[PDB]
Ligand binder design. Structure first.
Ligand SMILES: Nc1nc2c(ncn2[C@@H]2O[C@H](COP(=O)(O)OP(=O)(O)O)[C@@H](O)[C@H]2O)c(=O)[nH]1
Ligand SMILES: Nc1nc2c(ncn2[C@@H]2O[C@H](COP(=O)(O)OP(=O)(O)O)[C@@H](O)[C@H]2O)c(=O)[nH]1
Ligand SMILES: [Cl-]
Ligand SMILES: [Cl-]
Lengths: 178, 176
């Protein structure tokens, strides 16, 4: 309610993936909450990698963005309006859980932030009319844009993600990967 | 490429208006609210944006006017629409108790840089709003006990608000 808190839990199935739950102050006006402080959450990235980049992704119902990643970028991801099927893919070839995945259904009603290490596939599906997706990026030097990221097809038969659609709205990048 | 326009207010010195661009397509929009690279020259050496908050409010909620002695704030509305009102609460400023309104929404995605000792307020004109707020400060977070409050309808300030009957916290009522 009053003092800022975070519950932090490692994924039981994907090493290095973390589920962060903030508390909220709630009254008749709505809610206040802290998505991030340096003091509480800077330790979940290795020495002198700093979250230094904040992005919003506004998406319509049935949009699916993914599956995207790169070797530089730690991501802290949540949904601050509406609802998403957030799916993290293990893309580490050395990992026992290579090309396995974990889904989190994230909304203000279940306000979780997911921490992905680098070399992980990031994706989400918008299950609400509209969604606002918030994420913090931690990386050294220059942002890795689309041409330098990898792409796996949302419906890659090796990964076999459970999505609640057969007909998602996709970018040409995310269609090409099919 | 990630673009930010940085413009100083024509009304309140030290208040900056930051305008991002967006990638817009059939899916919606992708935009960057903040990078250390582009926006850290807006606060002094040694002082970092290190704290990210969200305020979810219903239609006709007014929160404000709030400030403190040390916090730099970068504020915007990422969903719905707010009348964002910055009040100059610096007594040594020539524009003490002047104000500037920004009607912020996804269709006008300005982020407002407030220095310390400024009045921060917003009114929700949409059914719901998501207010996003980055804080830059040295040391420990200043909570409500260590904040000043000016009344939303203080006649010395005379803010143009869309209503005479907003929904207010006990704190923002006391200030009246
Ligand atoms: N859990 C949590 N509570 C908060 C946070 N920020 C403020 N509060 C609490 O919510 C109440 C209202 O704070 P205030 O700054 O007066 O709220 P405002 O009217 O939205 O500006 C106080 O009890 C605060 O301690 C936060 O980030 N997390
Ligand atoms: N202006 C701007 N463009 C961006 C941003 N992030 C991505 N883009 C562009 O948006 C398009 C889609 O990017 P991508 O990373 O493929 O989007 P996703 O499929 O939603 O993850 C590309 O042309 C990118 O260069 C941003 O923060 N700002
Ligand atoms: Cl991503
Ligand atoms: Cl404030």
């Amino acid at each position: 309610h009053m003092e800022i808190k975070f519950n932090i839990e490692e994924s039981k199935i994907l090493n290095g993936v973390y589920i962060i739950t903030p508390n909220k102050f709630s009254d008749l006006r709505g809610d206040i909450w802290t998505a991030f402080t340096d003091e509480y959450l800077s330790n979940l990235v290795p020495n002198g990698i700093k979250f230094k980049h904040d992005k919003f992704i506004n998406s319509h119902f049935n949009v699916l963005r993914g599956i995207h990643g790169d070797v530089k970028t730690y991501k802290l991801v949540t949904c601050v309006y509406g609802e998403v099927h957030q799916v993290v893919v293990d893309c580490r070839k050395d990992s026992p859980t290579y090309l396995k995945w974990e889904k989190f259904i994230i909304s203000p009603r279940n306000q979780q932030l997911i921490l992905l290490p680098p070399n992980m596939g990031n994706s989400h599906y918008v299950s609400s009319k509209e969604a606002v997706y918030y994420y913090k990026l931690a990386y050294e030097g220059e942002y890795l844009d689309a041409p330098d990221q990898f792409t796996y097809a949302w419906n890659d038969e090796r990964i076999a993600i459970d999505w609640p659609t057969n007909s998602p709205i996709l970018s040409e990048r995310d269609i090409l990967a099919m």
